[PDB]
Each structure stands twice: as structure tokens, then as C-alpha cells.
Curated annotation (Swiss-Prot), chain B:
Lineage: Bacteria, Pseudomonadati, Pseudomonadota, Gammaproteobacteria, Enterobacterales
Subunit structure of this chain's protein: Part of the 50S ribosomal subunit. In TnaC-stalled ribosomes forms part of the binding pocket for L-Trp with the leader peptide and uL4.
Any GO MF annotation of the entry: large ribosomal subunit rRNA binding
Keyword Ribosomal protein in record: yes
Protein name: Large ribosomal subunit protein uL22
SUPFAM superfamilies reported in the protein's UniProt record: Ribosomal protein L22 (SSF54843)
Keyword Transmembrane: no
Biological source species: Escherichia coli (strain K12)
Binding site for L-tryptophan: K90
Other known facts: The wild-type allele (erythromycin sensitive) is dominant over the resistant allele, and is also dominant over the temperature-sensitive allele at both low and high temperatures.
A GO BP annotation: assembly of large subunit precursor of preribosome
Known role: This protein binds specifically to 23S rRNA; its binding is stimulated by other ribosomal proteins, e.g. uL4, bL17, and bL20. It is important during the early stages of 50S assembly. It makes multiple contacts with different domains of the 23S rRNA in the assembled 50S subunit and ribosome.
One of the Pfam families matching this protein, by short name: Ribosomal_L22
Family under the similarity heading: Belongs to the universal ribosomal protein uL22 family.
Cellular component terms (Gene Ontology): cytoplasm; cytosol; cytosolic large ribosomal subunit; large ribosomal subunit
Curated annotation (Swiss-Prot), chain C:
Taxonomic lineage of the native organism: Bacteria, Pseudomonadati, Pseudomonadota, Gammaproteobacteria, Enterobacterales
Subunit structure: Part of the 50S ribosomal subunit. Contacts L21.
Family listed: Belongs to the bacterial ribosomal protein bL20 family.
Gene source species: Escherichia coli (strain K12)
Function description: One of the primary rRNA binding proteins, it binds close to the 5'-end of the 23S rRNA. It is important during the early stages of 50S assembly.
Keyword hit for Ligase: no
Protein name, UniProt field: Large ribosomal subunit protein bL20
Curated annotation (Swiss-Prot), chain D:
Protein name: Large ribosomal subunit protein bL21
One BP annotation, GO: cytoplasmic translation
Family affiliation: Belongs to the bacterial ribosomal protein bL21 family.
HAMAP family: Ribosomal_bL21
Subunit note: Part of the 50S ribosomal subunit. Contacts protein L20.
Superkingdom classification of source: Bacteria
Cross-referenced InterPro entries: bL21-like, bL21-like_sf, Ribosomal_bL21, Ribosomal_bL21_CS
A family per Pfam: Ribosomal_L21p
Organism annotation: Escherichia coli (strain K12)
Presence of the UniProt keyword Hydrolase in the record: no
GO cellular component, one term: cytosol
GO MF term list: rRNA binding; structural constituent of ribosome
Function of the molecule: This protein binds to 23S rRNA in the presence of protein L20.
Curated annotation (Swiss-Prot), chain E:
Protein family (similarity comment): Belongs to the bacterial ribosomal protein bL32 family.
GO terms, molecular function: structural constituent of ribosome
Name recorded for this polypeptide: Large ribosomal subunit protein bL32
Domain of life: Bacteria
Gene that encodes it: rpmF
Gene Ontology BP terms: cytoplasmic translation; response to radiation; response to reactive oxygen species; ribosomal large subunit assembly
Spans annotated as Disordered: 1-37
Length: 150, 110, 117, 103, 56, 142
RNA sequence: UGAACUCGCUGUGAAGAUGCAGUGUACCCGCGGCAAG
RNA sequence: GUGAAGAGGGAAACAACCCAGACCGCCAGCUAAGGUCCCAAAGUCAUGGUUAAGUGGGAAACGCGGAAGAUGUAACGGGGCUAAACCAUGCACCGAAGCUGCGGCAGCGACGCUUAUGCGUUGUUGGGUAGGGGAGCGUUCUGUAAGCCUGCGAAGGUGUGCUGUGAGGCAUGCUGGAGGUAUCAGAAGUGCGAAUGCUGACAUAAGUAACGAUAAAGCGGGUGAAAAGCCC
RNA sequence: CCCGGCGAGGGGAGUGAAAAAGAACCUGAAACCGUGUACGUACAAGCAGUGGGAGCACGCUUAGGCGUGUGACUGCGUACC
């Protein structure tokens, strides 16, 4: 705390409590008994734990029918309107397009929309998987997820 | 009929002016005017000015015939107080509170 | 992250002031003084809850003894006669009957005397 | 015309047509209840019990309320022993109206 | 020489009860001018006992 | 249910006349105080004055067993430099005989506003004549 | 300046009681003084 | 053995003496020590006795005396008692949060059974300092959550009725005006009543001291609403 | 516009959703000081309350209490770390 260590008043004779400096926690223009520090909050999770959690999430989605398997899912042109039509035809609103290979057309089409988000099989997180209402898969995406999970 | 008149940030103190306020609380204008005129207080003239303002407001902004007017609700309350510093013996400093009072007068026919 | 306690302090102080409401002087305005009054008042209420039983018991004792001596018999003799006659009316009801219906109390004392004799 | 009877561990004296508050009962809020344990019945003349619960005296009542009493705060506070304890209580009450008295 | 504890507002009011002032309630009206003035005091314009005394 | 309590407005207080001739001071004062406190009635309430009015006559005819006739000493302090005064029962009777029984009753009765009220209810007269016949004070046998 | 609806005596009490139990006394509220607490 | 770490009743008032160990509620009964003339709840209870002393309700060697202290009776609590003082016996009443009668909460071990939980149950315990263990309430923000409420009215403020053993929660009368946030998890500068704890405002003494060398102001006229203090 | 002292300040008029949004100005709480209503208070002593508790002033259906405020009186009660 910016300031000085000078005693505000002499320790003896005064009718006020014992004070050593203006920076004390019970003083103003400075204090804070326990000042926070920049610290890393990352919590390490084992690779086996992460893989098991991902497998459990996939199994739960399959059981609840939140995972829909489909064939090639591509857009002819990077048109958000075309993507919206292709999702409204099947009546899907909150969706994660998990694809084996990332295509710029679909990525650009889905970037603007927030309810529909595109991701690659490698780039998947359990938090997003569970949060998204539905997850639509491709054959290659399923095969590579299976081989990665082992 | 309210014809309320209030004087704010008065120099006098609320404690001092409450005496004058209670002197005329519930009396008629005819007696109150002379009572304030012959009262030996600065608060007397301070409250007389407010009473005159109330009577004039009743006469102009509302019904005439101010003769049948009685001060129904007269009161005084402390307002903002100014702080000053005064030296004393042995280098001490004391704080002087210049007090101000708002005086409110409501006079009605009934 | 700052967690301002103004709202909680206001709520607790208002609750304590409401509990202390009705007291005299600063006991009903100052939280630091009102709070102590509420605890002492509650302690007194807890004690007086038990005290009420004994106070009413002795009040009924006095009422029944007074009525019996008015008719000319001791309270202990009255109770002994009632027990011998198998009268299970409690002291509260005995006092209430003595207050309201004098004929009922006269019958009670007559039966007590008959049982004693 | 007033009857004294024991209902919920305490004896109540009630006149005809009035209402009495007593301990909670396992009776519906709109149901009739009977009290054959009438300890005393009084009228212009006096009839007393040589044996408790008379012989044929009976009181018929109709339940009106099955409520809870006013909130009572129990506070324990130990002086200089660092202890304060708070509790709330609302004793259940059954209110009935005495609709009939027998002889 | 100093208070052992602060008095109460009730005690302050008890002390101040006698501090209240008193109204004259003795207004007098001039016989000639017919104007309100304190008894034995000359009027604002300068009339006393009917006859003017200040001549100003 | 709810407790009955005597209501001061609807209270009937009888009137009695008691002669203190040949009566023990303490025993007579006991009965007088019981009557004043209403412990002879089925309507007494600790916070309500329910007792009857008693008029004591021949207050100079009280009797005390043993040497209490002269050994008894009544002390009183006037709250002054050395104002403590003692007077025996004979002195009290000579000056005014009412005060001995009045002090007896005051010490017999509880202290407080209600105690003062019941003490006022009592009316003492040194002589055998009283001017309260308008209340029909039937003589009490005790 | 913890708060007071702020009288004296006896005995007690962390051992010198305005507030404990008893006792006696005391209309409520200001003003000029002494300073035992 | 008690306080510390136990409240309650008696000793008037007194932790350590006596009876008695408060899980919570009910305007029920009983009893322990201790009381039954009253203050102040209960026997002016009985029988056979002593006491003439206010002993009871302070004290020895000696023959009721011995026995005198200081603010006020002050060595029964008092009134007062010649039995209302003391010895022996009996029968009755009062007497605590102690026990019993009813209702409500929970741990512990069990068996008859439900088996991640009810119990047709069974017995008991639940004063508690330091301390040890377990179970919960209040708030900021993050994911949940670009979801939900929301200008036909959020939050704060200000009262009310319910609700749980409780921290608090719920809905609503008025100001308010655009923000708040379900449930489950994550982290706290996360809950203030004292540390002669700090900052800002207001009581208090109190409309009291004081209004600052005891060189000394007044009168006629003038301005001004106000003149003893401004000007001639 | 009016009063007030060609002041300060306030009552009218207008602006503005809002003027207890008026520059001392968003929301406007407590300590503290007042106004009005109802009660208690000038014969009664003490951690100021509590259990009981009559009366008084306000409303209700019923014609008795029930709801709030005051609460004389009575037993107990020598604050907190």
C-alpha cells in the first residue's frame, strides 16, 4: 500500500488505540488483510478420467436420443441462410455439428448462428457436448471418435 | 385550503424558533400579527415574515377574506448545519455548528 | 469479490427493533441496547411461563380456601372430603364454580362435609 | 346449564351454545364429536358425580377450527458462557362449538 | 464535574419544560387611533393616551 | 380455557365493625389484614383489592401477653442528624392508641400501591363510637 | 457518556450497594448555591 | 462432594451448605430439602411436656447475670407471637425445570422387517467451558444460463400473514425505476457487538461557560426595511 | 404572477413521464430533532422488562369477544465481552 510507516500518533499518552501505520487492514486508504494473488486455478484430470467421462457423456446422449447420426452434412455454399434452411427442414435449433473434417463452407455458415455450432471430432469438450441440446454426427466423425477413445 | 409557506435555511436555530412557533400555534392571524410584532426575539421577526408570506399567498393565489384565517399547522425543523473551526487554549480546536431551521406555516379558514 | 452486508445488517437490525418494539427510552431505538433487552425479555418470558402455572395454582388454592372458610371449613378438610367422595374437579374449576354459581359451591362443601363426617 | 368435562388432559367448563379451544384432536374440521366423560352438569338445580363421568351425561360438539396458536419464541442465553439458542413454537389447537348437552 | 453517563431525551424535555416563553396576552387598543399596542407603550406612529407625543 | 380474573369495577366490598377489647395484637391484626386482602372471599385477585372495609373501635383496649405491655419498643427515624426516637407501647397508647395497630397492619400487609390502598381501606378509631353507620357495618365475630 | 422510571439505614456480596432481601421515607418539574458520594 | 462446566427449590438476600441434574410444549398430579399466623402457597392440627427469659432471635470460665462501639431499630427479615418459643409421636396440605399424564424433534444397539428408507418397534439418552466430531442457513460472481422473470413494474427501502428446532424463505400495501435470477456444482477480501478498532453524520452536557486587558460612550442630523456600533 | 428587503427563501403558472426529478437535484434508510392522533403519567421508588391483568380510544361480525395502541395493578427479576 502506498504511504509511509510513520506512526499516526504516539503509542502512549494518547486516548486512541495503538496504531503503527496508516496501511493497517483496519485503517482506510489501504488495508486488505489477505490480498489476492494471480494464481492458476487449473485442476489436472487424468487422461483415463477424461476419456471415461467423454465415453459416459456419449453413452448418455445415445440413451437419451440427443445424438443423431447422419450421412454427409455439408452446405453447397457458405450461406448461413442455406444452413438455416437445412436445419429447419429437420427441425433442429440447438445443435452441435460434430464433423470428421472441418470444411470452411460449413464453418462459416454456422459461425454466425449461436444455437448451431460446428466442431471437429478432435476438438470436442464434455461441457459443450452436454450443454448443446442435440449433437449431429457423421460416419467419419463417429469412426474417428471411436478410434481415438479406444 | 393549505396556502403553506415555508422559509428554509434560516439563520436562527430551530430550538430558539420553536418557542415563537408554539407561542402562536393555534391562534388567529389578527392576534398573531401583534404578538410577533411585540415579541422580543429575532425569531419573532423571522416567523412574522413567513406569516405575512402565508397570508399574502392565501389572499392572492386562493380565496380572499384573510380575516377569518387561523394558523392551523406551524412547526420548525433543523436543516443543513454549517461547520466552522475555532481555536481555544493550549492549541485545541473545537467545531462550531452554525445551525439553520426551516419554519413552515399552514394557515386555513377552517 | 466484494460482498456488501448492508442489506443483511438492515434486515437483522429491523427484526431486532421490531422484537424490542414497545420498550422505553433508547431500549426501543438503539440496536446495541435494544438487542440486550430482547434477550432479557425472552428469558423473563421463559421463566414466567413456568411461573404462571404456580401463580394460578396458588390463586385457585386461595380462592377455594377463602370460599371454604366463608362456609366454615378449612381448605385441607375440603380437599380431603372431596377425595373421599371421589370428586376429581380441579382447583381451577372449583374456584370458577365458587365465583359464578354459589349454589354449586354450597353443594360441593355440603358433600365434602358429608364425606368427612 | 353448564357442563364440566375432561377432554385433552385438562378439564373445561362450557355453557350451552358457546365455543371452546382445547388440545388437537383426530377429528375432521367439519365433524361432530362426543364427550361422554362429563364430570359435572349444572342447571337451576345441581347434579353432582358420586362416580366420575356421571351416568348418562354427554356433550355433543362440532369442530370448527384445527389451527395453530400464536408464535412463541424460546430464547436461551447463558451469561458469560458463550451460548444463545433460538426456537419457535406454535401449539396446535382444536376449536369446537358445543351444540348439545344431555342430562 | 462531568457526567457519568448521557442523560435521556426525556430528562432533557423535563429540564426544558420551563424554558417555554409566555405570551403577553395584554394587547391594548388606542382610544383615538384604534391601533393595537402594548399597554403603557406608545403606538408605532407615536400616539399615547389618545394624544400624540412624538410629533414626528 | 381462559382464566377468570376479578374485575375491580364489579367488586362488592362488605363493611364490618371489630372491637379490639381483650384481643391479642398480632392475632387481631392477622384477621384484619386477611379481611382487607380478601382471603375470606372467592373473588380475591393478587392485583385487585377485593377485601372488605373494617372499622376498628376501642383501639386502646388491646392486650399483649407477657411483658410486651412495657418491653415492646417502637422505633422510628426522621432522616435527620440524630433523629431516631423510641417509644414503648404505653407511650404509644398515651399519645394515640391507633398507631400501634395501624403499624401492625401496615407491616402485616404487602407493600406497594395496592398495599397502601388496602391500608387506606382500614379505618381506625380510638373510641367506641364511629360515624360510618351509613354503610351498615355488621359486627364481625372474631 | 453501556443503558436508566437515578432516595436513606441494616446484612450479604470480587470483601466500602442509587438498583441484591428487609426496612423507613418520598407530589411532578425548574432556578441561586456547597461539594460528601 | 459442588462451582469452574448445572439452571431450579430452602437458607431474605451468599458458586462452593442442603434437596435436586433443565431435549421442547401443555392454566395437570406427586414428592425431595424446606415450609403450613401473615406478608408469602399451605395445620391459628391433635396428644404428653418445658419455658415467664423477646430466651427463641450471638459468645465462654464463674455465680438469668457475666454480654460496652461507634450513619439509623440493625445478633428472628418484618408485622408480630407466651405458644406463632423448644423435646417425643401421629395424621394432613404447600413445596422445584426432580418424577409421572398427553403431544413434538433426534443420535445409539438390536431384533420383526424396509434392505441406498419407513418403521406395527424396543431401551435409553439429548446442563454443558476449553476442546473433538457431524448436519445446515445468508450473500458476490462462474457453468448451468444468448435459458427464465422483468416498464400491466426488477433491486434497494418501507409494514404485514404464513413457514422451519434455526440461520432465513415465500406473497403482498407504498416510493422506486431497470435490473434480477430456478435447481445442482465451483472460489470466497463471504455473515461484526465491543479490539482506549478507523472514516462521515448526529445526540449529550446546553441554549450553560464564554462572547478574548475594567481607555468610556452618548446625543442632534443623514442613508437604510431594520441605527448604539454605517456617514456629518 | 405574488409575497418577501429591486435579497435569500417560498406559494402560484409553464416545461417535462415524473418538480417529495429544481441545479443542496437518480434511488433516499438509521442515529438525531418535530408535527398530529390515543392512552398512562403530579402519592410513587430500582438493568425499566416479563406471565397475568381491569379500564380507556379506535373497527368487526355479532350484540361476546376478536384485532391494534395505551396500559393502573400484581409475583419475579442487581445489563453485555
Amino acid at each position: 500500500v502506498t504511504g509511509s510507516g510513520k506512526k499516526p500518533w504516539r503509542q502512549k499518552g494518547t486516548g486512541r488505540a495503538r496504531s503503527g501505520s496508516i496501511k493497517s487492514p483496519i485503517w482506510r486508504s489501504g488495508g486488505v488483510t489477505f490480498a489476492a494473488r494471480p494464481q492458476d486455478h487449473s485442476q489436472k484430470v487424468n487422461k483415463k478420467m477424461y476419456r471415461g467421462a467423454l465415453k459416459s457423456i456419449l453413452s448418455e446422449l445415445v440413451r437419451q436420443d440427443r445424438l443423431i447420426v447422419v450421412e454427409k452434412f455439408s452446405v453447397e455454399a457458405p450461406k448461413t441462410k442455406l444452413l438455416a434452411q437445412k436445419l429447419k427442414d429437420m427441425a433442429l435449433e440447438d445443435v452441435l455439428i460434430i464433423t470428421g473434417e472441418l470444411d470452411e463452407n460449413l464453418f462459416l455458415a454456422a459461425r454466425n448462428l449461436h444455437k448451431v455450432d460446428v466442431r471437429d471430432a478432435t476438438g470436442i469438450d464434455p461441457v459443450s457436448l452436454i450443454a448443446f441440446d442435440k449433437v449431429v454426427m457423421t460416419a467419419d466423425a463417429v469412426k474417428q471418435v471411436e478410434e481415438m477413445l479406444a | 385550503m393549505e396556502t403553506i409557506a415555508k422559509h428554509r435555511h434560516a439563520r436562527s436555530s430551530a430550538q430558539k424558533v420553536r418557542l415563537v412557533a408554539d407561542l402562536i400555534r393555534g391562534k388567529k392571524v389578527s392576534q398573531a400579527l401583534d404578538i410577533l410584532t411585540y415579541t422580543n426575539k429575532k425569531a419573532a421577526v423571522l416567523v412574522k415574515k413567513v406569516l405575512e408570506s402565508a397570508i399574502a399567498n392565501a389572499e392572492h393565489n386562493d380565496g380572499a377574506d384573510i380575516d377569518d384565517l387561523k394558523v392551523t399547522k406551524i412547526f420548525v425543523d433543523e436543516g443543513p448545519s454549517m461547520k466552522r473551526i475555532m481555536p481555544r487554549a493550549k492549541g485545541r480546536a473545537d467545531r462550531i455548528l452554525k445551525r439553520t431551521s426551516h419554519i413552515t406555516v399552514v394557515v386555513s379558514d377552517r | 469479490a466484494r460482498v456488501k452486508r448492508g442489506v443483511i445488517a438492515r434486515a437483522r437490525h429491523k427484526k431486532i427493533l421490531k422484537q424490542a418494539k414497545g420498550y422505553y427510552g433508547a431500549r426501543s431505538r438503539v440496536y446495541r441496547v435494544a438487542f440486550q433487552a430482547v434477550i432479557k425479555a425472552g428469558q423473563y418470558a421463559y421463566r414466567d411461563r413456568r411461573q404462571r402455572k404456580r401463580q394460578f395454582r396458588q390463586l385457585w388454592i386461595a380462592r377455594i380456601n377463602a370460599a371454604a372458610r366463608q362456609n366454615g371449613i378449612s381448605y385441607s378438610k375440603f380437599i380431603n372430603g372431596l377425595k373421599k367422595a371421589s370428586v376429581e374437579i380441579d382447583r381451577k374449576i372449583l374456584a370458577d364454580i365458587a365465583v359464578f354459581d354459589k349454589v354449586a359451591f354450597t353443594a360441593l362443601v355440603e358433600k365434602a362435609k358429608a364425606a368427612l363426617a | 346449564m353448564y357442563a364440566v368435562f375432561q377432554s385433552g388432559g385438562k378439564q373445561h367448563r362450557v355453557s350451552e351454545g358457546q365455543t371452546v379451544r382445547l388440545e388437537k384432536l383426530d377429528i375432521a374440521t367439519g365433524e361432530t364429536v362426543e364427550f361422554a366423560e362429563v364430570l359435572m352438569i349444572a342447571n337451576g338445580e345441581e347434579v353432582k358425580i358420586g362416580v366420575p363421568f356421571v351416568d348418562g351425561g354427554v356433550i355433543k360438539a362440532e369442530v370448527v377450527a384445527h389451527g395453530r396458536g400464536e408464535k412463541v419464541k424460546i430464547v436461551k442465553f447463558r451469561r458469560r458462557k458463550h451460548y444463545r439458542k433460538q426456537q419457535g413454537h406454535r401449539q396446535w389447537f382444536t376449536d369446537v362449538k358445543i351444540t348439545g348437552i344431555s342430562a | 464535574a462531568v457526567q457519568q453517563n448521557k442523560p435521556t431525551r426525556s430528562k432533557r424535555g423535563m429540564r426544558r419544560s420551563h424554558d417555554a416563553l409566555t405570551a403577553v396576552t395584554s394587547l391594548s387598543v388606542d382610544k383615538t387611533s384604534g391601533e393595537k399596542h402594548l399597554r403603557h407603550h406608545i403606538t408605532a406612529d407615536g400616539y399615547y393616551r389618545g394624544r400624540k407625543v412624538i410629533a414626528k | 380455557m381462559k382464566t377468570f380474573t376479578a374485575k375491580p369495577e364489579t367488586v362488592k366490598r362488605d363493611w364490618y365493625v371489630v372491637d379490639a377489647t381483650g384481643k391479642t395484637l398480632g392475632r387481631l391484626a392477622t384477621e384484619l389484614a386477611r379481611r382487607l386482602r380478601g382471603k375470606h372471599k372467592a373473588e380475591y385477585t393478587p392485583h385487585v383489592d377485593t377485601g372488605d372495609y373494617i372499622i376498628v373501635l376501642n383501639a386502646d383496649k388491646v392486650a399483649v401477653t407477657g411483658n410486651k405491655r412495657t418491653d415492646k419498643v417502637y422505633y422510628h427515624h426522621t432522616g435527620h442528624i440524630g433523629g431516631i426516637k423510641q417509644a414503648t407501647f404505653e407511650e404509644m397508647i398515651a399519645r394515640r392508641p391507633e398507631r400501634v395497630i395501624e403499624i401492625a397492619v401496615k407491616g402485616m400487609l404487602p407493600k406497594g400501591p395496592l398495599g397502601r390502598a388496602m391500608f387506606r381501606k382500614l379505618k381506625v378509631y380510638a373510641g367506641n363510637e364511629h360515624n360510618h353507620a351509613a354503610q351498615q357495618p355488621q359486627v364481625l365475630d372474631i
